[PDB]
Amino acid sequence: VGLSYSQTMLLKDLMGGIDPNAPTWIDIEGRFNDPVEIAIFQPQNGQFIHFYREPVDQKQFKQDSKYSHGMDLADLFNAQPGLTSSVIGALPQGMVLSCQGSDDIRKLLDSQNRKDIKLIDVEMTREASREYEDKVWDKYGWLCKMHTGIVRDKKKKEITPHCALMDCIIFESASKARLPDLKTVHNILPHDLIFRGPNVVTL
Amino acid sequence: VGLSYSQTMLLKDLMGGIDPNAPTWIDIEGRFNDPVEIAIFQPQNGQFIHFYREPVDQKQFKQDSKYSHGMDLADLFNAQPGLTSSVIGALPQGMVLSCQGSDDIRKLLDSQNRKDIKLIDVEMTREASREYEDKVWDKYGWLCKMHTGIVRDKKKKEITPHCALMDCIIFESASKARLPDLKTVHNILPHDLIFRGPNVVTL
Amino acid sequence: VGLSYSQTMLLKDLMGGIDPNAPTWIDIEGRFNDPVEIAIFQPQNGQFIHFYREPVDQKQFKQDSKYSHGMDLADLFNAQPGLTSSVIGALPQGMVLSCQGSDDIRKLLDSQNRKDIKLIDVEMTREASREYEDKVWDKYGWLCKMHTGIVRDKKKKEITPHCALMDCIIFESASKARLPDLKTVHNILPHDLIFRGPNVVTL
Amino acid sequence: VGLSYSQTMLLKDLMGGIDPNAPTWIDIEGRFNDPVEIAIFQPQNGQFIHFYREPVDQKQFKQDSKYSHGMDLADLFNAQPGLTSSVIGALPQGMVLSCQGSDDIRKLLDSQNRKDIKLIDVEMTREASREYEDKVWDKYGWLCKMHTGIVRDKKKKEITPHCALMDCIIFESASKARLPDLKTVHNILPHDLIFRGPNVVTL
Amino acid sequence: VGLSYSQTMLLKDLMGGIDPNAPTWIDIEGRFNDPVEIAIFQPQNGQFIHFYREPVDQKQFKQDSKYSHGMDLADLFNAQPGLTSSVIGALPQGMVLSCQGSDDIRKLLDSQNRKDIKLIDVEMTREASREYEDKVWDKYGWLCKMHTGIVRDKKKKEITPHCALMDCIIFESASKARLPDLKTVHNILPHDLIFRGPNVVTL
Amino acid sequence: VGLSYSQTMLLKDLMGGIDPNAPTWIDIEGRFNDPVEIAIFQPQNGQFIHFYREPVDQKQFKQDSKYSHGMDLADLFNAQPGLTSSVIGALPQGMVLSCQGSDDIRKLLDSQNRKDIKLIDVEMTREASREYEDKVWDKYGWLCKMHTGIVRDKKKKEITPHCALMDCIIFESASKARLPDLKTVHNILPHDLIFRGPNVVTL
Amino acid sequence: VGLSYSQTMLLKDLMGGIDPNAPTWIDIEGRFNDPVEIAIFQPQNGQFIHFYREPVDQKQFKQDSKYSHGMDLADLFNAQPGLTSSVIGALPQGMVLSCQGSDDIRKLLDSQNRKDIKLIDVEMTREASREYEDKVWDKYGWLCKMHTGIVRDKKKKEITPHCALMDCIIFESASKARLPDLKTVHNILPHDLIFRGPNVVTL
Amino acid sequence: VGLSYSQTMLLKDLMGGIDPNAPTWIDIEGRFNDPVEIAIFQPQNGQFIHFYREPVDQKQFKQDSKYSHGMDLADLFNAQPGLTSSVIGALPQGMVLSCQGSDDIRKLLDSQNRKDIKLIDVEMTREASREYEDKVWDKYGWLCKMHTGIVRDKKKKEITPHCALMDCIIFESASKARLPDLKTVHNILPHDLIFRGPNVVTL
Numbered sequence A, B, C, D, E, F, G, H: 001v002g003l004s005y006s007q008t009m010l011l012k013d014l015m016g017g018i019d020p021n022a023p024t025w026i027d028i029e030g031r032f033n034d035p036v037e038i039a040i041f042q043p044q045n046g047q048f049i050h051f052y053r054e055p056v057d058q059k060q061f062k063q064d065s066k067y068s069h070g071m072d073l074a075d076l077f078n079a080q081p082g083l084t085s086s087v088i089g090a091l092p093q094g095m096v097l098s099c100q101g102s103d104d105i106r107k108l109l110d111s112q113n114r115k116d117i118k119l120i121d122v123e124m125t126r127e128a129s130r131e132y133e134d135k136v137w138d139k140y141g142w143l144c145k146m147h148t149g150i151v152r153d154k155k156k157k158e159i160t161p162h163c164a165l166m167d168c169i170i171f172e173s174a175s176k177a178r179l180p181d182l183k184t185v186h187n188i189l190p191h192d193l194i195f196r197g198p199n200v201v202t203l
């Protein structure tokens, strides 16, 4: 379906937690046209938005699963449709978003008619990536148990998967030379908005 | 598609005009599962909600067009999808709605998970229908130019079509023995929300 | 409902016409999870299986109708439920099926637990598609009068719809550089098995 | 779901054991519209059909459990759907079935469009019921361990439950003044057809 | 089972958010020996602990469901066992907890050998209860959609159910004459710790 | 029960003595699914973990008692439940464990989610076993007084029992051609964690 | 455990169906000391005994699964213990059993102290094996759905698994140059004796 | 092991001597969960069942030996396993058993799933105990030479041990004010069924 009216009213309220002037990270898995996991993280307060999307192109998903995110199609069948378009639509106006590699994000933001949003492509050395990847996945990896597959590189070497939320925390760590010390870190989105149990139908 | 996030934010604002305690009429054309025109009229202030929906079942539409509403499929291709589900979702909590023949309305309200809404089936004599039908279509018929087809009865007799908005004003007239004297009567919904010019796409 | 016991007994008999070693084409309209028209064609004898299915996802159907098959929901309400699962279940063991683009067929055959069935993805040039499309729709297009809608491409150009049965005959033509000269070509399935007039109810 | 195509093909084969001219007993537990256990017994050869059905009306089941069959809802969740409708549709044409109290059976057979089947209401004295009930439940009661609840009468007196299969053997005993001496007595239906382990889904 | 070792390590970390000197509310549904829903709310920061427990006594649950909380047994089958004993065990030593009616809480805390914890029985007028109940269930009621049953009083009058988390927010409102204005309010416990998807087994 | 919260907190602290990079031995008595005595020994520092578990299968225990470990059921009734699952969960990450015969250990480690743990199957000649068995049981046999039964081989020959802790010291001796000279050798686990005096109950 | 007293009394009764003078086939999977599936088939009447046993040696089972029977350990955990020893003990005295390759059967019968039983090693050509294997697995393969694994030969060629019951029917076919035409073929053992749902414990 | 098939067949025959309507005594030594000697005595005919069981809990046995029965572990190593569960399983249905102190017997009968058996707790004065104890141990004490240990009371006073069989004869004496005059009194169980010489092994 899409987001229902009440779901959209809730979303409006939850997005009230997002500080529009706060420095903010964004990362996705999948392509701008077919993203399967979105994460928006505000390090200052530790608030983040994190959800999933079932892929349209099943073949590419499987390949993107074996070589980057390692996700499973079965875990995505219940993701609430409309979330990507509604969270990107609900983002405040003129928000400055930080990312790693602006190319994929800009295309998605543009295809959702959100050109008002400026992007900060932050550069990150592979050395700095290797440093915090393991530290982040240990302190904060309980937030996403969705990467249950083996990801290998061109050289068939098994590698740590990418998580978008974990990628955001890694990015913040590298940009700050300090893994963030955050007491409270939480998703503004409830589990019943991210996933779909009962059925609602639009007209 | 569905109603976009901004469209839904506008709707929230416009629905602020609807007085939840005010006596209110509702009528539709088409069946609960496939309605093609919805009207919600508050006689006290003269505010109303009035929009259209493209039918799923094309064959039934044509038959319902020759025998009740006389609408044309071509005029419905541009109706904004999601309007029926979003206006019914936005209707204030615990609203008492008046109608003629509660059977069709209740089913629609229930299928949109809006059981909180109570209905008042108001009875109307055919004599009283014949009285105000012509008077309403002359004072207020400029509000809906959507019935451009010939409607006939079982006896192939050409009859005045039904308009839902006009039906609401007729119902109010019969229930009050007075065609309403209303200076200001207007749709809370703008023409660009009722119809779809440019293109927006959900994810 | 599903296929009744007697309906299934008839099916068993009619499927006796299908030659298991014969070269055989398959095509569908709609997705593996929600197919709305299935065609299985054996060019050697001219026998084919051809039926419809009402779609679960009404929104996608409409979009797939405007951009590929041009079907009408109203014509699908009476399709006999259970046909897709029962015809795929009844297909002879180890049948080698030819198709255009194996991705969609394999998923459907797998979701119906029919992995025994091997697929031959036959490649077809658009030039060869353009050649026989019109010739097939003229000699054999009377077999399917179900595409009563306008289908347009990305460039709003009105295009010939896709029919699965017609697609099978087009595929055979391109693979053979000869539109088939077939005196007898017929559906093994009767009109009362493809569609549902009276009512039977399972327990 | 319903019975799959292969399941129905197996059923066709197993029903080949049923002798159509053989004297045959039938009994159910639950009402014609909501039966929870069916038994069809041919005393001559000792072959029988015996299966279960999850009840639709949960409240009535519980009451029918405290006052007749003493069954447990939890044991019925895995009964293979479609069995009642498919076993009744597969019964030989014009089969003469014996029963105790034709009223409930006729309604069920009629609601499954099986009017061809004639019924013999055999009368049975309560004295004769009391005689073989205990003898049957001891020699043949190992065939149904599904009655794990306490059944009481109007006078709160704990009574032996009713089993449909056991009821059939009791009926045969009373009609013959001899508890049947049967070396081989067996269900034609396998445990995997009566109950559902893995998952199959229709389209 | 119980809480696994890793689950307990996570819990230790999440409980680090609980401020031991902060004023804190507690409420349960069900009895000290058989509680089915626990809520611990710290109004200052808006952090709370909120989870469920499957009841041992099924009959009492149903009665407590018809007359207080209106919960459904089916929604409790997947609650993570060991949570009640482990969250009560993890609470800071000498914590001062506020409640409504200390009798039920003290017994539970004592039966979990947590006598170090002092209780503040805060008195609340029914007038003040009636005031904030509706306001809380509207602003914060999206946090628990577990009360899907009709609760009636001695006079068969349908009444608003009790939610423990909602009860905590109502209690804070009455004690402060102000419904709390809280931007961030969230459960310290993740959905996968509150509920049980995969299987772990102790030795 | 299981390990309480405080017990688990203590365990976390005691496991801090285990050096994760240190060479480490493991041995059990009983099968992976039903182990009755576990020993984990780090020869470098002389620290070890050593505890017991009451067997589920009483018959197999008795047979395993007459032919390997010679233990007594009565001494196992007070072993603290949850110890096996909690010590295996608390083992440091990426611990390389040495053993004799990796088959039984791997299965147990895979019963918990500890596949991260690699195993070194060290080969040991019976000649080398016969050498240190007596020397170890004399210098270190006071550490385990739990083998109070007569163990015989296939030839009814009374043989020295197996102790897991003693087996670890024997294994280290054979792998090093030197019975270890260890001043300080001690269990990191206290007697009150290995055994259960008072009563704690989970919820 | 073992077979309970009542279970053994039932067995005594069911074994009354076995005709002691009837020609009878036997086959097993696994070794004499560790058999995992036993089948005893009397072609004359079509009666057979067929059950499973959980293997002691888990490693050998897996290898015997990849190279002969293709069974899964998980399906054997619930097999009723004691069945092998009790069915071999209940076999009529001096029964002449036919088999393929007497070596494995004799050892098992001897280890169960049943030397009274004579064996007929019937020779079977691989040509004759290849003939009926497919025919038997199609007419009678619904009797055993326990071979859910891929079995390959020395040349990594995927081959049809062996089923003991199917092997018995294949053996009878080859010895008779006719696949048996059997209306009634059934297991004398009920599903609740072959598998273990509830718990009984010996002393 | 357990009782073999032949052993169980013999038992069935010997239990044919037990008159199900006859008044019958039962007594045990050891607890319901760990009984070491069972006696079932029918005074009318003088038939009795009397056997032993090796204790699981060795420590409790020794204490129960010093303070009640005075038995020796060494004499119990050869008791035939499975006897307790098989004799209790074989007891005729609906047998009214007399005992002294129903608490221990009921628990044992229930743990062996024999609730059908009703118990008569017969009261006995210590005066009446002191009267027949010596008379019974002299006329019938040759039936049990198993109490070869010194039993003392709380006051270290050496007392006559308890024998279960002797206890049954004492109970009958007290209930009848007459030591029974019985020419023939004998165990229905043979010495080779009560004790185990050769070896049989189950599968």
Ligand SMILES: [Zn+2]
Binding pocket: A037, A144, A146, A147, A162, A163, A164, A165, A166
């Ligand atoms: Zn992720």
Ligand SMILES: [Zn+2]
Binding pocket: B037, B144, B146, B147, B162, B163, B164, B165, B166
């Ligand atoms: Zn109109």
Ligand SMILES: [Zn+2]
Binding pocket: C037, C144, C146, C147, C162, C163, C164, C165, C166
């Ligand atoms: Zn078509």
Ligand SMILES: [Zn+2]
Binding pocket: D037, D144, D146, D147, D162, D163, D164, D165, D166
């Ligand atoms: Zn029954």
Ligand SMILES: [Zn+2]
Binding pocket: E037, E144, E146, E147, E162, E163, E164, E165, E166
């Ligand atoms: Zn709640």
Ligand SMILES: [Zn+2]
Binding pocket: F037, F144, F146, F147, F162, F163, F164, F165, F166
């Ligand atoms: Zn030891």
Ligand SMILES: [Zn+2]
Binding pocket: G037, G144, G146, G147, G162, G163, G164, G165, G166
């Ligand atoms: Zn098999």
Ligand SMILES: [Zn+2]
Binding pocket: H037, H144, H146, H147, H162, H163, H164, H165, H166
């Ligand atoms: Zn004695």
